[PDB]
Paper text:
Therefore, we have determined the structures of Cp-1–[name] tubulin and Cp-52–[name] tubulin rings, to a resolution of 3.4 and 3.3 Å, respectively, by cryo-EM and further characterized the binding interactions by molecular dynamics (MD). The interactions of Cp-1 and Cp-52 with tubulin are very similar at the current resolution. The contact area of Cp-52 with β-tubulin is 380.9 Å2 (339.2 Å2 for Cp-1), similar to that of maytansine (313.2 Å2) and rhizoxin (333.6 Å2) but less than that of PM060184 (489.3 Å2). The contact areas of Cp-1 and Cp-52 with α-tubulin are 339.0 and 373.0 Å2, respectively. The calculated dissociation constants for Cp-1 and Cp-52 are pKd = 7.24 and pKd = 7.09, respectively. Key residues (buried surface area >40%) at the interfaces are the same for both Cp-1 and Cp-52. There are also conformational differences between Cp-1-bound and Cp-52-bound tubulin in that α:H10 of the latter is shifted out of register, relative to the former, by 2.4 Å (i.e., half a turn) toward the exterior of the protofilament.
Residue numbers in the entry:
A (entry chain O): 1 to 436
B (entry chain B): 1 to 427
């Protein structure tokens, strides 16, 4: 049998972990008790969903995952929430001092004095499992925890587990919900120390998700609840392949192979069509071809970028419920007709497809409107240059004034080191520019 | 629950802090007896940071009051919270607070501050977690600054991994008298700069110029000042007291707010300024509120921010209005006043909103700024000291109890350095 471990670092990370995990438990027919679907009820399952949950004696399907933060602000806040008994008490760690938007705070002050406990817990959890494949990372650029602790933890993992792959679910930060102006600094400081250990990363854009929750989801003041639920839905729409059945993009290694040409460049865009708002009953109907052709629109692209102005490298999809391959191929052929899309001049660039036999499951008391068709494009479009260069520009504006430098310097960083990292990511931008 | 130990000293410090503590207790609704008589459960959720717990489940605020004139509790009981502070730690002096630095900062009073430090150290550990230290006083001469910066030096010595904060008040030669203070201030702040990074400069001159000219006053008394200050520097910490978006901790407040390890003099304001009138007033609207926000007269400092540029701005709204629409006029201000902000620091507008309204007021908003503007106030206090240093007045006692002239000159050098830094970062 196989298995995987999802890590959860940072306040944002653990919020999204709660939302995602509750949605996943709901979807498979599991319940906050996890009584039994149809199986042996003790060491049962045998379908793909066992790779996330494992039954205890009661057949509870305990999710072998952990949540981590440096302050007992949110960890406890959900430890006495809906899923109190779903996870193991004393299997959720609570730090003491908040990283307070300081990357070095999570890197050499407080996270460095606790990481040993996290390593012990994850290693014990791995000893409990038998079929580990890799790791799923939920963190954020902006926060000190979700960047410094993330980087240091994954460095330790790459030191001790040097074979398995790993996938990062980070959150690209936005000014409109910004809670710091040291946020580009932490973002660069962590990401410059990821490529050497990172394998693939799924970063989500706050401004993009915010525009989704408003322009189509009918919200004006979205809290973390709205954005978090929507991103949990899109993350489920991505990982459904690993959740259910043998199809396109089953394994993490398969993920990266289908997606990652060159090890340094492992940032793929993602989309998920159904963003239809809410209890608003029906203004139109659904269609496979409709959603498939509307997928290419810049509407739902997880990160704001201009794909049509950049050469592609690959294209994967995934569909929920209402299976029939024929019209799927017809839709592919219709969209195949080269309006303005381009591809790679030295390899086949077919639209790989793998379909699933289950319609999307919506939260029982939330905003999203029930649907049964869906697409999920994991395009490896080069056009994420734009966003990375925008963040780099926002970075190097504040380096002529030496702003905020001392705050990171005081705990063990170096002033000129930032220039090395900036040149590293200028070279990465050059690497995107290379493909032409 | 990272608790905070409150340090407080001096005649003016105790005067301001008594009314401040009264205001915060009233807003939190705990009875002047010391029991929760509030009006909801959103009050005591984590407020242990300011209010500890007693055996009988009654709460107990933790804050030290010290001085050098023997009678302080005799004056602390002048309000409504005399016995409320725990009645074993009103450490009192013997002589008084004549406008003499180093009379508390070197020889006497310094003898008492060793026991003071022992008592505060004993006080600290009982809490679950420590946030840091924050201090309320004025830069006024006479045991007011000496004890202050002295205790700053020792607390910074003992706990480098915490955060200081000063609510000091700059004296000014318009409301007051006994003019030897420029010495006391421009010498104490000379090492406050190196010793602390979290300051609020409530200009007493500005408070007079707004309280007596365009606030319908004739002779501003000290309670008159106390009203405005116990409003603004009590609403400054609602973010600490109330959960919300920008819950930033002292360390995080700094890292969001202080770019350089010296340029850390915040100049606050408060749009619905109100003299002591029982009737509240006619209602005001959100755009009017955020326009009186940047009212140059409203500023608790000695400058008009139109004359300069900002570095790192905060804001804390309070009341019931349009939660999510405030961003509209935040970005409107940003778009129409790009010149007011700086390009070196983008997105310098951290904003948040608190549901609770203050006592005796529905719509309001505490403000915090960080601008080049305070260069004006520092130039004022530098000239109002250098034009008189040539005559060497009154330095007899200072040169007798343990100072020297080179110290005065190097303090002037440091303050010219700070004004130069503000000037060049404006250039
Ligand atoms: C041209 O000469 C002038 C003469 C008088 C005035 C007005 C005159 N004063 C000053 O500006 C003199 C300031 C000095 C200061 C010196 C530098 C500090 O070490 C002093 C000290 C304090 C306590 C113990 C031992 C030493 O002393 C004092 O603190 C005392 C107050 C009491 C306690 C004697 O002094 C006054 O303030 C007097 C009593 C109140 N009245 C005034 O408003 C202005 C000028 Cl310009
Ligand atoms: N989508 C989404 N973004 C979030 C959420 N919580 C925080 N963010 C964003 O994530 C970024 C920083 O993450 P935070 O959770 O604030 O930081 P943190 O990881 O707790 O870090 P420290 O405060 O330093 O301990 C900001 O851009 C936030 O707006 C959430 O629940 N959902
Ligand atoms: N802001 C404020 N300033 C005051 C008050 N009372 C006096 N002042 C002035 O501000 C300074 C007060 O600090 P300090 O000199 O330490 O007071 P002292 O302890 O009475 O000597 C003095 O220069 C006073 O002239 C007050 O209630 N509030």
């Amino acid at each position: 049998m196989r298995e995987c471990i999802s890590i959860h670092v940072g306040q944002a990370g653990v919020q999204i972990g709660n939302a995602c995990w509750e949605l996943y438990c709901l979807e498979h027919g599991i319940q906050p008790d996890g009584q039994m679907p149809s199986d042996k009820t003790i060491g049962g399952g045998d379908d793909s969903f066992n790779t996330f949950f494992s039954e205890t004696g009661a057949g509870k399907h305990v999710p072998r995952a952990v949540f981590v933060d440096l302050e007992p602000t949110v960890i406890d806040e959900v430890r006495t929430g809906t899923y109190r008994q779903l996870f193991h008490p004393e299997q959720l760690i609570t730090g003491k001092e908040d990283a307070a938007n300081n990357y070095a705070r999570g890197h050499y002050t407080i996270g460095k004095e606790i990481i040993d406990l996290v390593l012990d817990r994850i290693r014990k959890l791995a000893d409990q499992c038998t079929g580990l494949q890799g790791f799923l990372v939920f963190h954020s650029f902006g926060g000190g925890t979700g960047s410094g602790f993330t980087s240091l933890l994954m460095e330790r993992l790459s030191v001790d587990y040097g074979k398995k792959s790993k996938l990062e679910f980070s959150i690209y930060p936005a000014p409109q919900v910004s809670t710091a102006v040291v946020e580009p600094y932490n973002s660069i400081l962590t990401t410059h120390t990821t490529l050497e250990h990172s394998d693939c990363a799924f970063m989500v854009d706050n401004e993009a998700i915010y525009d989704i929750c408003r322009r189509n989801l009918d919200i004006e003041r979205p809290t973390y609840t709205n954005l978090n639920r929507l991103i949990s839905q899109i993350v489920s729409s991505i990982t459904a392949s690993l959740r259910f059945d043998g199809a396109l993009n089953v394994d993490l290694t398969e993920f990266q192979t289908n997606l990652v040409p060159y090890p340094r460049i492992h940032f793929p865009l993602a989309t998920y069509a159904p963003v239809i708002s809410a209890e608003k009953a029906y203004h139109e109907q659904l269609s496979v071809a409709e959603i498939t052709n509307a997928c290419f629109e810049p509407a739902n692209q997880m990160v704001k970028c201009d794909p049509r102005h950049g050469k592609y490298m690959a294209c994967c999809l995934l569909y929920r419920g209402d299976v029939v391959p024929k019209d799927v191929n017809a839709a592919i052929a219709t969209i195949k007709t080269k309006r303005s899309i381009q591809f790679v001049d030295w390899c086949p660039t077919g639209f790989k497809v793998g379909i699933n036999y289950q319609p999307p499951t919506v939260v029982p008391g939330g905003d999203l409107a029930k649907v049964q068709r869906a697409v999920c494009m994991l395009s490896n479009t080069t056009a994420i240059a734009e966003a990375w260069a925008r963040l780099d520009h926002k970075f190097d504006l504040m380096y002529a004034k030496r702003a905020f430098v001392h705050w990171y310097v005081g705990e063990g960083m170096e002033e000129g080191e930032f220039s090395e990292a900036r040149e590293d990511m200028a070279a990465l931008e050059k690497d995107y520019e290379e493909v032409g | 629950m990272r608790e905070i130990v409150h340090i407080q000293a001096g005649q003016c410090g105790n005067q301001i802090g008594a009314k401040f503590w009264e205001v915060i207790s009233d807003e939190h609704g705990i009875d002047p007896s010391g029991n929760y008589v509030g009006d909801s459960d959103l009050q005591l959720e984590r407020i242990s940071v300011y209010y500890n717990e007693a055996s009988s489940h009654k709460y107990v605020p933790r804050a030290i009051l010290v001085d050098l004139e023997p009678g302080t509790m005799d004056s602390v009981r002048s309000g409504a919270f005399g016995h409320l502070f725990r009645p074993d730690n009103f450490i009192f002096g013997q002589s008084g607070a004549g406008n003499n630095w180093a009379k508390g900062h070197y020889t006497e009073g310094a003898e008492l501050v060793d026991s003071v430090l022992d008592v505060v150290r004993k006080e600290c550990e009982n809490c679950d977690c420590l946030q840091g230290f924050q201090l309320t006083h004025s830069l006024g001469g006479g045991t007011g600054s000496g004890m202050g910066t002295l205790l700053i030096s020792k607390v910074r010595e003992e706990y480098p991994d915490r955060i200081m904060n000063t609510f000091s008040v700059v004296p000014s030669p318009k409301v007051s008298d006994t003019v030897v203070e420029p010495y006391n201030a421009t010498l104490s702040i000379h090492q406050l700069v190196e010793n602390t990074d979290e300051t609020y400069c409530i200009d007493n001159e500005a408070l007079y110029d707004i309280c007596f000219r365009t606030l319908k006053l004739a002779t501003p008394t000290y309670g008159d000042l106390n009203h405005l200050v116990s409003a603004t520097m009590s609403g400054v910490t609602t973010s600490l007291r109330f959960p919300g978006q920008l819950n930033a901790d002292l360390r995080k407040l700094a890292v969001n707010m202080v770019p350089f390890p010296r340029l850390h003099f915040f100049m606050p304001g408060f749009a619905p300024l109100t003299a002591r009138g029982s009737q509240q007033y006619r209602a005001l609207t959100v755009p009017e509120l955020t326009q009186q926000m940047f009212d140059a007269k409203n500023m608790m400092a000695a400058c008009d921010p139109r004359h300069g540029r900002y570095l790192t701005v905060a804001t804390v709204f309070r009341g019931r209005m349009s939660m999510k629409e405030v961003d509209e006029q935040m970005l409107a201000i940003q778009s129409k006043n790009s010149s007011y902000f700086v390009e070196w620091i983008p997105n310098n507008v951290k904003v948040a909103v608190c549901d609770i309204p203050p006592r005796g007021l529905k719509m309001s908003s505490t403000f915090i700024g960080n601008s080049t503007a305070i260069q004006e106030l520092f130039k004022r206090i530098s000239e109002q000291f250098t034009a008189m240093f040539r005559r060497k007045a009154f330095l007899h006692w200072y040169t007798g109890e343990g100072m020297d002239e080179m110290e005065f000159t190097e303090a002037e050098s440091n303050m010219n350095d700070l004004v130069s830094e503000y000037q060049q970062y404006q250039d």
